[PDB]
Symmetry: D2
Subunit: 359 residues, 4 copies
């Protein structure tokens, strides 16, 4: 198990940015700028820095040219400069590796601490950042598919309760989760900023990064992203969706960048900011839980996910889930799901919903 430090948690505001390593910077640029319409804060031969429509800090996304596509850092902003010190001491007491830089690891951040956390993810903590033009009323730039906010991260890790417990101590609150009747946990959603989440744990072989998620204003904006990809004839890059989530109640779409990093597009979850906000527990065999319309979850969503780096730039060793697999118990050959609890009509045995089995 992971222990609670005596030293006090840093105060975390929100998820703020991610640094992804990409192999071909021109090819990733066409996708994140031309196709999806993020806005360039700064760029050179080695890096592109990008922000959503309504953001005032330097970037929400850094693309870094490198040899192996992988997550380099997930960054959280914290409330005061002094909370960075607090991060340092707190992870020092957990016995984790930490690396601090008073001018930052990337353009347009200042005093920053990166760490290998006890599940093996590169986490960054900062306050200082260069403010840029907030574009939020720049409706002369607005695209039909506009991405307005960075909303959350999603991490793959093989023991969900162990990760859950370490993130409650750091101050995150659980909003929803997926279990069975016999006490296995399959995923958990957890928050700092009063949306459904800032990061989430998906049971699975890790450490790996499942996705990063940007927000739209309205549901038609997500539809337009699917339409555009059809017109550019890259509909093979739409992995899953669009649809409505059970868990989180948000409208969604999952797409894939040229290195197969997964991006979610996401809108219209609910408010969680009150400390007794009711938690929601779904049964794993509930076919309405991940997609409310009962559409099947494509196998790659469970199996594929992005590698993560240590502080030296080497890939983290993968540790295998031993608990039950969500893929296996729902859509595999000995799996099942239901539409109405306890009813064999609109139940599925050994296959996915709507007439499909696994290819």
């Amino acid at each position: 198990e992971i222990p609670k430090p005596v030293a006090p948690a840093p105060d975390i505001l929100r998820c703020a940015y991610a640094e992804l390593v990409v192999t071909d910077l021109a090819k990733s640029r066409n996708f994140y700028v031309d196709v999806l319409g993020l806005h360039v804060s700064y760029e050179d031969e080695n890096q592109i820095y990008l922000r959503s429509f309504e953001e005032f800090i330097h970037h929400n996304l850094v693309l870094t040219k490198g040899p192996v596509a992988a997550l380099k850092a997930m960054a959280f902003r914290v409330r005061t400069p002094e909370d960075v010190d607090k991060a340092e001491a707190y992870y020092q007491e957990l016995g984790c590796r930490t690396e601090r830089r008073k001018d930052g690891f990337v353009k347009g951040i200042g005093d920053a601490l990166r760490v290998e956390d006890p599940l093996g993810f590169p986490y960054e903590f900062f306050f200082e950042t260069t403010h840029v033009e907030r574009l939020h009323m720049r409706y002369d730039l607005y695209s039909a598919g506009e991405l307005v906010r960075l909303d959350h991260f999603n991490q793959v890790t093989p023991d969900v309760p162990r990760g859950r417990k370490y993130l409650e101590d750091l101050g995150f609150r659980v909003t929803e989760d997926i279990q069975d009747d016999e006490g296995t946990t399959y995923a958990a959603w957890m928050h700092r900023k009063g949306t459904v989440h800032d990061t989430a744990l998906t049971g699975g072989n890790g450490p790996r990064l499942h996705h990063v998620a940007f927000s739209t204003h309205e549901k038609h904006n997500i539809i337009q992203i699917c339409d555009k990809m059809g017109a550019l004839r890259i509909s093979d890059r739409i992995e899953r969706g669009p649809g409505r989530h059970g868990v989180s109640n948000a409208f969604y779409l999952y797409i894939l960048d040229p290195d197969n990093h997964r991006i979610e597009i996401y809108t219209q979850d609910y408010y969680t900011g009150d400390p007794d906000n009711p938690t929601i527990t779904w049964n794993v065999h509930d076919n309405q839980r991940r997609d409310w319309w009962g559409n099947p979850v494509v196998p790659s969503w469970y199996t594929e996910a992005s590698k993560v780096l240590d502080l030296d730039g080497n890939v983290q060793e993968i540790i295998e889930r031993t608990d039950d697999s969500e893929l296996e118990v729902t859509i595999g050959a000995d799996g099942f799901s239901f539409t109405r609890a306890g009813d064999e009509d609109g139940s599925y045995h050994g296959q996915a919903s709507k007439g499909f089995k696994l290819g």
Copy 2:
């Protein structure tokens, strides 16, 4: 082939209504009134008459209680009273069985002709109908999924070329179709009223009724129908969608009624009224032709459809398709589909798109 008669064709305006036979009248009323929100023009213990938000003729849909779920009539409105006489002389010349009633076959229709057409579908032609209150500004009744118009029918029939020719002679115009490079035609779409269609031919064992289609104002209205069926826990009655059509460019959803009559919901196709409107031919192997975003067509959409009756009320017997099957050549075990013509990336051999095989 089917001859062109000497007698002039009736002048058809549009699709107007369908009579469907249903087994349980209470359960059907629940689906169509309580779930879908259509408006009752009249009802009694045997029959319900339903119209959509913007319609002013008596009804767009008659439900009639009977022993076997089946289509009983698909109704086209003609331009003048005299075009009912022309429909009778026309189909008599083809040697088709006909029945004329001065007083209608259902309430709210006047002088009316039903026929067993040469493909064995029960067509009705009428001019006279009872006007009712047009509800088009009754925003006090508008639901979040309001169905606003009837749009079209879609018919299953073994020989599409044989079928389209007949329909062309009668004055329908082809707008789009689906073919391969060996000269097989799998489907054709055709209109009178200035949209992409008023009826369609889908290649398959027929005569069978594939679906009936209503439109909405906007795409979010269709999302609401899905969301609602989620909340009432009948997501197993969503067959296919929602998504964006290739053919027709409409936003779409397919659902099933308690007797497995399929209903499509549909919005935002394009204008076809000019007589030199350019026809679009899609290739059957093109994985964006039915769903533009490449999501797989569910098997039940190709195999299942509703029975139809002759005019003595017996089920029309089935004739098999001998021409190539669209299911078989796209997602069966020696099937093939592509995303980009000439590219092995984003192509599919012996399976469906996004990682699924046939259940």
Copy 3:
């Protein structure tokens, strides 16, 4: 009163395009392309040919450099080539000026007739047109405010019943109108293609062209336009709206180009194509008739509209309306409108809705 010719009427499909004379072509290009997002079929130093997102004929709008901002032609397409010959006989039998060109008056149009019609308007009729790439599934090119079709014209003319009869003989069919209890017709809406209209008549001093109208797919598209014009600090070129109409039931917005031609953006009216489509008459004092939410109609909407040209390029003389004016009787000093018939609460005497005088 205008006679019905013995000769047969041309079969008109729909409105197709307008040619408008503009004064600075650069400044008009910035409006119709950069702000509004219409698609160039062709341009040179003197003309820009624009089309909407779903059009397959050559153009929905020609901008032509000229000394006087005006309407040059309003064009309707007919169903066959022989309907152009049909049109020529019909307007000759009215004693109207006609000019025919076998290769057209503008690019992308073939055999074509222009008339000074009996109301002094420039009507073009044609079949032949050059086909271009139908951009309807080009979502790589989709604007958040995309204009998807041409919907209709609106014409200002002094005597509306006189006009209406003429268009009925031509085979247009009236869908909605505005009258009062004293015999006056104020406006009228009429179709060939099976939407609420292709053209319409607004009582006023004319001939003038009141506006051209374009469709969007959804209501949010029309909002984006207003939000964009905000962002560019040209909100002052939003005349009226956005809103929902009484007449037509459509969501709407009116904006002004750089020569003050008026453009409407429109969506989600209803099907009119059955021949017993029920006509709706509104009373002129009904304050939900033009904006259903009862927002006031800005005076400039009643008073301003574009000059039109005769067939030699001269501005048509303007003839004054003698029947009562829709402005004077609703929101001028001696006007009246109501929210509910017979109810003093929510009625306005001598002023507009929501607290405003003119």
Copy 4:
């Protein structure tokens, strides 16, 4: 001026509910249930308790029958039970009248303090409340105009900076305001929850309540409410809008209940949760500041607003504003506003925009 107490401020989460006095309970029920489709958590002969689609606390709105229409209380929720003790001490130090009831003032709320604050408003602070079914996925019950959360209050007071300063000591952070260059502050917006506001200060005579505001999901939802009020022929109870704000960037509408309590509908403002959020100041004479599209602000918006009650159920005594009026210096006869600063095109002197005066 209003002193910073030594006692610690209570930790305020958000606006939570308002209790409004109404004169006819059955007509107000018809407005708030049948027209707007809020969800009943409890009612009887004297009170109705109402919540929005995504709420899980007992109510966002109480309607209480009484002789005069007014605001009985605007309630904020605080993080812990201990915070209600802090609020009591804090306001006792300020010299303000306090009443603590351990069993609450209304149903579904437990331990609560109401206060007459220094600006004359009835504020409640509470943590304990009864939980009820969270209806967020009950799409079986979802209407085309669904109100999904309660968003904010807006208050009228005659000296904004004095009020600003009071709320800043309480933990509220200013996000946007309106000033001129003569020093004068006309209005200001502040928050706890990390949207643009939880309450706001509008310069004018008070104490009065300007409005309570509810959210929608999307912009078409707000449109539907206008369209529905047209079909019910109560478009005269649409005061102002729909529109897009400058300040806050939100899509908006303002409507009037049967007692002339004003309700905003509101969607799609921005995240403010970061402690260094850039503060935005608008010039008062800028005609895109309250309506981005430049539509005129109706005078009733500036001059009308609800009464408020003291803790005895009596009406506060109103206090005149001596500072410049926002109405007078924008849309009355010595006023002006611009579209583009330094430009006389699209300027209005002595009248409102789009061709009106008052």
